[PDB]
């Protein structure tokens, strides 16, 4: 696989960092007055 480092870089990012920030910012948005 050409650029085989990209799955190992992006899958942890997309699966843990993206949903964590999305849930945190959505929580902040929906709970703020």
């Amino acid at each position: 696989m050409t650029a085989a480092y990209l799955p190992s870089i992006l899958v942890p990012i997309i699966g843990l960092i993206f949903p964590g920030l999305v849930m945190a910012f959505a929580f902040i948005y929906i709970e703020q007055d």
Partner: protein, 659 residues
């Protein structure tokens, strides 16, 4: 709390109900605070742009993930032995045996085996390498960006369209019929003639040479001379090897009919003439309505003028024009119904007449495609009826529809629902009685006592299409019929060769089990239609609740009074009909998969003997074919099916949670 900014009542909710109801009403723009019709239409236009961009991004992602992690260049060379790869696996929760067991397709990393059939489609339309797959992915990324920019632009001031532009029925119909249907079909025929057919004959055509590589040796001179039949001369030989010049023809437009004998798929020249003809027919349809130049038809006059003078339809179609133009839900129901009908048509006709090379031998791909598009069809039809019910709740004006066809539906809604109930109970009583009767007589050791009705009507239809199995000797199965002599010079040899060969799914032989399962399918369709029609027609009110239209399309109940009013809304009728839709697609897919597995195994008599009773379905289809699925992982090891072995159980968990 200002998350649901579109609902002040929801934003003042002090509980967790606010988040859920803001999530479920976020795209219900008609119910929002202070929504005007022009703002509604502009938001809908931009949302439609966004969905188009999402579709283009998904297709570009499929193309890119194949160009990067697939085996397309290996698969083109050996299509019938190499397993197609959908995308790569990177899961850090895997152990080493799971890494080993998913390493298939001739690559050195774990992969998923593709079931979507994108390999056959992309190979048939002329892609051969990974480079053009990546270029197509780039083009669709650019196109998605263009449509995102258009969605932003057509919401900007001095570009926001007016309500007269959105409700221009004649202009939108003419442009979408002539250009979106017609010219798109003509361009796809052009792509098939110019690119796909030469690449099918082993000669490379790309953007670098398509202006110097003629699709036909005579050029466009036979088209401009009116000697069009020169394009029908020298078709592909029955010895043609797809993707090579060996046995290749020079024709670009034929109507040969049947299947290519090697790919078991439709001739590409037939597809090119089909899409050319579809473009011509649709452009002729797309000049019908008057937009700016006096000629053309007026839609309002056509609707008002077609009132039968006997008065059986009342006022006819008077007021349907304003009712349809003013209601987006009536339009949405019509569109969803028509879309569901044609995706059912796609599901039946693509297994029966496949167009993609070597896809008739990919059994998993055919099963996945049929099941997918049939479930989409059930969802679309249920949505059509649901949004029709919403049209009765929100948009139906009786005073604008005095003695209309819609009003007369409402005036004999009770007869419609009662006769739907009668036919549903009829079908269920006697179909279940025959099935249980056959079960009881087979269990008692007497299968000769079964009630087995031969489906002679559909067999007569098959013989009318040319099937000589049943000996009916009528129409195309008669060598002296006027239809046979009419079509003998054009399409009859290839069609008769394809329909009378038992190597494809063209008009498969049918017996008493086929009879019973189609009448069960009729039962399920009529019962789902009963639930949906009864929900739509009682949406405005019933004897138990005559003011239901004051309460909207969705509400929990009207309280325990008057005997109890649980699930009385039309949304609740949608909710009840969803289970019946799942049941109907389940029965259809069970029939399709069991029949096709028994034919592919060479054991069609197992289906012919076991489908007449329920125990045959439970044992010879469900229990018998579950063995590799439940052995995807076991205490002795695991293999590549294990994920499905997980997902299966996953479904058995989550289904139960719904209860």
């Amino acid at each position: 709390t200002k998350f649901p900014k579109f609902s002040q009542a929801l934003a003042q909710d002090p509980a967790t109900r606010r988040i859920w109801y803001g999530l479920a009403t976020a795209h219900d723009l008609e119910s929002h605070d202070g929504m005007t019709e022009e703002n509604l239409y502009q938001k809908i236009f931009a949302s439609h742009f966004g969905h188009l961009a999402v579709i283009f991004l998904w297709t570009s992602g499929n193309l890119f993930h194949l160009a990067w992690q697939g085996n397309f260049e290996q698969w083109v060379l050996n299509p019938l032995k190499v397993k197609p790869i959908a995308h790569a696996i990177w899961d850090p929760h895997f152990g080493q045996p799971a890494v080993k067991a998913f390493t298939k397709g001739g690559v050195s990393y774990p992969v998923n085996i593709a079931t979507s059939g994108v390999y056959h489609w992309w190979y048939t339309i002329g892609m051969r390498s990974n480079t053009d797959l990546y270029a197509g992915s780039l083009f669709l990324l650019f196109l998605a960006g263009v449509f995102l920019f258009a969605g932003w632009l057509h919401l900007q001031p001095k570009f926001r369209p007016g309500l007269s532009w959105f409700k221009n029925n004649e202009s939108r119909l003419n442009h979408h019929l002539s250009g979106l249907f017609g010219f798109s079909s003509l361009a796809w025929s052009a792509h098939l003639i110019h690119v796909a057919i030469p690449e099918a004959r082993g000669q490379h055509v790309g953007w670098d040479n398509f202006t110097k590589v003629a699709p036909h040796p005579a050029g466009l001179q036979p088209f401009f001379s009116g000697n069009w039949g020169v394009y029908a001369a020298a078709p592909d030989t029955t010895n043609h090897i797809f993707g090579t010049s060996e046995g290749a023809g020079t024709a670009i437009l034929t109507f040969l009919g049947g299947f290519h004998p090697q790919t078991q798929a439709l001739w590409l020249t037939d597809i090119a003439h089909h899409h050319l003809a579809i473009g011509v027919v649709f452009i002729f349809a797309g000049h019908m309505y008057r937009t700016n130049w006096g000629i053309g038809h007026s839609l309002k006059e056509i609707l008002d003028a077609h009132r039968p003078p006997g008065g059986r339809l009342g006022a006819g179609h008077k007021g349907i024009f304003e009712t349809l133009t003013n209601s987006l839900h009536f339009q949405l129901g019509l569109a969803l119904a028509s879309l569901g009908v044609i995706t059912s048509l796609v599901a039946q006709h693509m297994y029966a007449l496949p167009s993609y090379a070597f896809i008739a031998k990919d059994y998993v791909t055919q099963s996945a495609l049929y099941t997918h598009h049939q479930y989409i069809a059930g969802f679309l039809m249920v949505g059509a009826f649901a949004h029709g019910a919403i049209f009765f709740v929100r948009d139906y004006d009786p005073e604008q529809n005095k003695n209309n066809v819609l009003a007369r539906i409402l005036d004999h809604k009770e007869a419609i629902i009662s006769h739907l109930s009668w036919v549903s109970l009829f079908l269920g009583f006697h179909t279940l009685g025959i099935y249980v009767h056959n079960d009881v007589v087979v269990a008692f050791g007497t299968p000769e006592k079964q009630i087995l009705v031969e489906p002679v009507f559909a067999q007569w239809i098959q013989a009318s299409s040319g099937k000589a199995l049943y000996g009916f000797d009528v129409f195309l199965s008669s060598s002296n019929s006027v239809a046979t002599n009419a079509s003998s010079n054009i399409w009859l040899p290839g069609w008769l060769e394809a329909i009378n060969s038992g190597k494809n799914s063209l008009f498969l032989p049918i017996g008493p089990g086929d009879f019973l399962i189609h009448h069960a399918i009729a039962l399920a369709l009529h019962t789902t239609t009963l639930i949906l029609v009864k929900g739509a027609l009682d949406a405005r009110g019933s004897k138990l609740m005559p003011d239901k239209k004051d309460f909207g399309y969705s509400f929990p109940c009207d309280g325990p009074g008057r005997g109890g009013t649980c699930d009385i809304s039309a949304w609740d009728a949608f909710y009840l009909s969803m289970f019946w839709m799942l049941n109907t697609i389940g029965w259809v897919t069970f029939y399709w998969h069991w029949k096709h597995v028994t034919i592919w195994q060479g054991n069609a008599g197992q289906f012919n003997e076991s489908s007449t009773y329920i125990m045959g379905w439970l044992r010879d289809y469900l229990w018998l074919n579950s063995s590799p699925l439940i052995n995807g992982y076991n205490p002795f090891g695991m293999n590549s099916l294990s994920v499905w072995s997980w997902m299966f159980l996953f479904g058995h968990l989550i289904w139960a949670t719904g209860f």
